[PDB]
């Protein structure tokens, strides 16, 4: 594919552009994100 | 495919273009998100 | 795949552009992800 | 693929451009994420 | 693959262009990681 | 692969293009990480 | 999606379940094809 | 989509179940093609 | 996607389930194809 | 994606399962086929 | 992905699941091909 | 990816699971293939 | 075309006969502007 | 075209005659514009 | 074109006559400017 | 083109008639300017 | 082109006629600029 | 191109005519400019 | 400007994208142009 | 300028692509052309 | 500028990318051009 | 300035990237160009 | 400038990338060039 | 400048990458040049 990004990305907490791939017999577990202002 | 972004993006609390592909006998699990102001 | 990224890319806690590939009989747990202001 | 970054890339806390690959029998755990300002 | 990055790179806690790969009855454990300002 | 950077590389403690490879029955922890300001 | 095929593919002279994908200018040819019995 | 062939495809000269897909800024040619019994 | 082909792919001259992809700024050629019997 | 093949593969001139993929600035050629019998 | 092949692969002149990948100005070429019986 | 072949590969005249990978200026070339039999 | 200007421009803060031309998947920003006296 | 000016061009904060031309996938930043007498 | 200035260009903090042209997956910033009298 | 300037240029921080032209995969920045009198 | 200028060109703090022209993959900087009186 | 200056230029601090050219994987830095009268 | 052509373009006697820019003081002339079938 | 062909260009007698620039008391002449057929 | 081609050019009596530029009290003559088939 | 050509070039009788650059008081003539077949 | 070729060049009688560069009172004549087949 | 080629060059008769500079009162005459088949 193509991506093209031009500008601001902003995350507070969290992941961004992940990418998991090719699994077999695969497991786990993601915690909860806060965000406070 | 083909993705093009011209701005600001802006996400508190999350994942942003995340990508799980090509799995076999798999299993996960996402926890909550909190977003205060 | 084709990636660009042009301008300013800002995570308080987390991961980016995070790649597990080709795992057979793997597991792991991610923790929690905080973010104050 | 192909990765191109033009610009100013910010991770208060977490990891930036994670490659893991090729793993069998394969475990492991991560810790939590706080960001503080 | 082919990575190119201009600009500057910030990372307060954390690892950068990590390389895990070709491993067999592996376990490891990462810690916690904070940022305060 | 190829990788070019041009530019500056900011890590207050962490880890920084770090290559574990080809291991067979092995185990190993990597402790905590803070950044104060 | 989900293709299932059962039985006989005979082809003289050809290709067979060719895919072209994610492409950007690009340009290409492919000549004649001739069949006798 | 949802896709079953059973039975026989007979094809003298040409291309079968060809998937052309994601193209920005292409252009090709296919030749003649000729059938002589 | 799903794919399963359960019987026989017969090819005088041609190519056979090939994979193009992913190009940016790409060209080439296929000649002619020719089946006597 | 998922991809099962049960059966005979014949190919009297060609190429099988071939794969070009993740390229910029490429060019080539292949000649002609001939089967005969 | 996952490719499973069971039975027979006969080629008389040609080339199979060949990979090329991550390329960059690159350019190539492959000739004639002749079956005869 | 993961890849399974059980059965046989034959081949007269040609290449089998080659891989070009992770190149940059480069270019080369491959001759005629006969087969008589 | 034809532009003729015949006496006094004043600009406290801001662009004079600023030309943005000939552009494809362009973005940029201009900030605030402040006049005090 | 033709431009033609006679007199006086005062500029306390900005940018004159700028000329940004023929650009692809390009992205700027222009900040703020203080004036104070 | 043609372009004719005849008198005073003053510019207390800024650009002049900048001409940015042919460019392909750029990027920039130019900070903020300040006048005080 | 045709260009012709008669008179007087005064900057006090600034650039002047700069040229950035034929540009591939660049990325640069400009700091801030301060004029006091 | 064809550039007549006859006069005065004066700077506290910059740079003149910069000309960067024929670059692939490039980054630079250049600080901020103080003028006092 | 054709180039005529006829006059004075003056430059209390930064470079004069700077030509930068045909660079390929090139990377620098230019400091800060103080003028003080 | 912008310029793309996907096709044939086939001129029998003549000139094809000619530019001829910046002149002064400049002539030459032009012969004819024949075509026969 | 940005210019993109895909495909054929035929020119019996004549010139391609010709640049003539930024000339001064310059002159020249160019002949017939003839194509016949 | 940018120039790209992808595939056949063909000139039977002529120049393909000549490029006369940055010239002063020059001159020159070209000839006719013929073409027979 | 940026070329790119991918494919094949012919030029019966002629010339190919010619560049005349940076001439005073210059003079030079080139002959006929005759194409038979 | 920066020249990419890939592919076939071929030219019967002529130059091919003739670079004649500052030259003061020069002068040269070229003579014919024919192509027969 | 920078100049890469990829593929086959011929010339059956002419001269390639000739290069003549910084001549002053300089003279030369250079011949014909036939091609015959």
Same mark, same amino acid.
């Given at each position: !594919?193509?991506?093209?990004?031009? !500008? *601001?990305?902003?995350? &507070?907490? !969290? ?9 077999? *017999?695969? &497991?786990?577990?993601? !915690? ?6």
């Amino acid at each position: !594919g193509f991506f093209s990004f031009i !500008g *601001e990305a902003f995350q &507070g907490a !969290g992941d961004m552009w992940r990418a998991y791939t090719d699994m077999k *017999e695969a &497991g786990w577990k993601d !915690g909860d994100k806060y965000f406070h202002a």
